[PDB]
Amino acid sequence: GNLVPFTKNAFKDWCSVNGKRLIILALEISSAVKVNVIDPSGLVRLLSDLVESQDTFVYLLSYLQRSDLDIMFKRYPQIGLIAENGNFVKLIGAKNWISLADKDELNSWMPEIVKLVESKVERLPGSFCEALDATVRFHAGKSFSEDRERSLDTMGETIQHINTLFEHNGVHATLVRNSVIVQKDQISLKAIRLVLSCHNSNLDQKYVVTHINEFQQPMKDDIPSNDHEVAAVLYSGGLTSIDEANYEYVNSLKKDIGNTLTVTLISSSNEETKTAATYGVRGINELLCILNS
Questions:
Q1: Is 46 helix (H, G, I), strand (E, B) or coil?
Q2: How far apart are CA 90 and CA 96, in angstroms?
Q3: Domain boundaries defined on the chain
Q4: Which of 26, 71, 187, 252 would you label with 65, given CA atoms 20 to 30 Å apart?
């Protein structure tokens, strides 16, 4: 609420560089007929000028699984995709997904996580389990209205249970809205770093896949190649803990990239919530109109 408003001038200033521009948009995409939600065709339409620019690369960061995103954006190859918050990446123009998630890790831990969450569901009527390929989400569902206190208690209990058992694997549970999400530590940061590296150092997919262990390493270890092909990076999101980690990371890139900009969607009322984003916008249409200017 106390952030400087995102404007066309601030955006155009950010664009004022010699080199590639990387834009990562963490948006809730829905094909349904929250209020800051948009459909695939609307997103592409509202950014038609932005994407048609030759030096600009736009990526969607989404919690959705690969198969849902492929259905949504099959007709729109101009948009890069990052699925399940970073576990999978489809570079612009690519036919195949890159798995940042390690399949042996998935095969080993996902069934245990799902079983654990399902056992919580049994003891909390109205709740349900959503299992994707590399993430698990425990939804309070109707249990939240039946008894919000019991629901929150059970979710907090579940967070402690999962973190105690899986933290050593680099896996954590977090409370997001009225659900618990289980994911790989800093996987969104690692995906952003991977996408940035590809466009910054001109990596082809085969190199990335062959050297995927390097992109799976902790965010601490970072020495970028001589290339500065990308001269500007922008991240837009909301006000979640995961967004915050992304804002802080993109903000920190100012030492390596040149121009960086972070902007968050704000509303009435999450105005008092703290954020590391530099700028704020009050709606998705306003955000996209600025980015397309």
A1: helix
A2: 6
A3: 1-103+187-293, 104-186
A4: 252
